[PDB]
């Protein structure tokens, strides 16, 4: 009944704050912080977590009837298979350190081979962010597919090691090898790169990009098309394969959608001024 749960900061899905308890719309979440780089010693710093996925976790805890010990992943991020070993939130679940992973965790085929995912609770996929008026059709645009056909070539990148880079690597080998020189360390660096003209496009998770375009100062940065999405999928709760918790978590998430509880969370956390 008391479950180890892993998460990862990615606003507005999971936002981390300093703690001497956690109040209001926040829940306790710990983060293992190293003492130094010449030791394995670290300490579990008490922090506070809030956001769309934290609200989902609170609703599930109440409906499905479980308590939890929420922690922030420190071995990687969302999840990548490196030399056949999963790291990130996926790895925590695979290697049974967490009963479930809650956050901005994209459902894809390779992860579904090692973890069970709940039904999708946030629609996502791959979108492209550009300055308003940039002429790009989608991922199949020749500027992306055959970048050296243009002089100067289009400058575009993603945040590596997540579901978006894995999809690009598998589908568009030339685009992928071209793009790696434009890897962005994170979403905030990518938005700065777009706004200062160092990048022409940023390819990333649709739900995060729609949230960022919604809050852009001056509403200059937009997602291409009618907020077009390639490889439509969703964020899902990752559970261990054969988890006894999946059935009731799925029914609860479906109950929240059916009762309009998800639309309320979308208004509270995702919709912006733009």
């Amino acid at each position: 009944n008391h479950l180890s749960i892993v998460t990862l900061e990615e606003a507005p899905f999971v936002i981390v704050e300093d703690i001497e308890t956690c109040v209001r719309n926040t829940v306790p979440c710990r983060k293992f912080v190293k003492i130094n780089n010449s030791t394995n010693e670290g300490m579990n710093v008490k922090k506070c977590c809030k956001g769309f996925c934290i609200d989902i976790l609170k609703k599930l805890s109440r409906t499905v009837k479980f308590t939890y010990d929420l922690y922030l992943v420190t071995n990687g991020k969302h999840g990548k298979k490196v030399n056949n070993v999963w790291n990130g939130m996926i790895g925590e679940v695979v290697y049974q350190r967490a009963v479930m992973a809650v956050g901005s965790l994209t459902i894809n085929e390779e992860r579904s081979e090692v973890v069970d995912f709940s039904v999708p609770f946030v629609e996502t996929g791959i979108s492209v962010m550009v300055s308003r008026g940039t002429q790009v059709t989608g991922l199949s645009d020749k500027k992306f597919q055959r970048p050296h056909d243009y002089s100067p070539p289009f400058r575009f990148g993603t945040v590596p090691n997540g579901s978006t880079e894995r999809n690009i690597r598998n589908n568009y080998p030339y685009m992928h090898q071209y793009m790696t020189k434009f890897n962005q360390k994170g979403v905030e660096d990518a938005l700065v790169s777009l706004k200062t003209g160092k990048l022409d496009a940023f390819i990333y998770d649709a739900a995060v990009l729609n949230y960022k375009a919604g809050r852009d100062e001056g509403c200059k940065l937009v997602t291409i098309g009618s907020g077009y999405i390639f490889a439509t999928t969703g964020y899902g709760i990752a559970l261990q394969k054969g988890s006894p918790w999946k059935r009731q978590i799925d029914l609860a998430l479906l109950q929240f959608v059916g009762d309009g509880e998800m639309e309320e969370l979308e208004t509270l956390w995702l919709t912006g001024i733009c």
């Binding site: 039904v119 996929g125 490889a231 109950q255 059916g258």
Partner: protein
């Protein structure tokens, strides 16, 4: 040999008579490729409370291409039939409760898999296994071009009278949705008097000014509006929902069906089906 149940629902499932010889007319897609067709047995005239005469018919469309892709990927053979009562499926009180439509056929063993634009919802997920969604969509409202309705919160919907008639399809996910939400009870009581046996009959009634608004799946309604310029959709999507393949909870195919759907979204196969069947025309 899997028994597949489906339903007429353009552009997902087109249903046409066979030729005199019992085969299907050779046709080409919008992109010049041959249309893959399957024989699907089912009742002809679907008049309520009447005997059903089963005859072979021709089925094709987005869901049939998806079925063929699933069959080749997982190496299974199948036989397709149209749901006998022509409904998607709801659980109705008879203390005892029963499932009708494709839900009833899958649970009784009349079908082994539902391959149709079947909405994933709590009510059905308690009884059957749904795949990860093969299509993400939601609900919208179809009106005759010129009819001014803001959307789901329009006073002509929220404070109804017999001057403005709106409806959905009986025994569908939309019927479930409106019956479950207490806040939608005013609308549910209006629709209950006017619900249609099938989406095609409701869409025709909007064209014929017999139904003022039809509340249904955006994947279907946006297609209809893209083909018939006298028809328009109005308002933002609500009840964002997806379609999934339906199987019994003990199905040995459940994991590989979901992996195949995820693989199809990721490699562009799902977008190829959207380009072939859903998004090729504009009004």
């Amino acid at each position: 040999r899997l028994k597949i149940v489906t339903i007429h629902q353009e552009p997902f499932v087109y249903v046409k008579p066979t030729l005199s010889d019992g085969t299907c007319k050779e046709e080409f897609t919008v992109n010049g490729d041959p249309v893959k067709k399957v024989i699907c047995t089912g009742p002809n005239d679907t008049s309520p409370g009447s005997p059903r005469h089963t005859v072979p018919q021709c089925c094709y469309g987005f869901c049939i291409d998806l079925l063929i892709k699933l069959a080749r990927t997982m190496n299974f053979t199948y036989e397709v039939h149209l749901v006998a009562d022509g409904k998607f499926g709801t659980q109705e009180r008879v203390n005892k409760k029963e499932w009708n439509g494709m839900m009833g056929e899958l649970l009784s063993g009349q079908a082994d898999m539902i391959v149709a634009p079947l909405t994933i919802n709590n009510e059905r997920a308690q009884y059957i296994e749904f795949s990860k969604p093969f299509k993400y969509q939601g609900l919208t409202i179809l009106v005759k071009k010129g009819t001014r309705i803001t959307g789901i919160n329009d006073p002509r919907l929220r404070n109804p009278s017999d001057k403005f008639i709106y409806a959905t399809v009986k025994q569908s996910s939309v019927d479930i949705y409106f019956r479950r939400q207490v806040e939608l009870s005013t609308m549910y009581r209006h629709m209950e008097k006017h619900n249609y046996e099938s989406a095609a009959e409701a869409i025709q009634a909007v064209r014929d000014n017999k139904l003022h608004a039809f509340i249904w799946d955006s994947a279907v309604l946006e297609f209809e509006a893209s083909q018939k310029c006298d028809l328009v959709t109005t308002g933002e999507l609500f009840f964002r929902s997806g379609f999934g393949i339906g199987m019994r909870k003990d199905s040995p195919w459940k994991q590989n069906v979901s992996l195949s759907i995820l693989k199809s979204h990721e490699n562009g196969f799902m977008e190829d089906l959207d380009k072939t069947w859903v998004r090729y025309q504009e009004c």
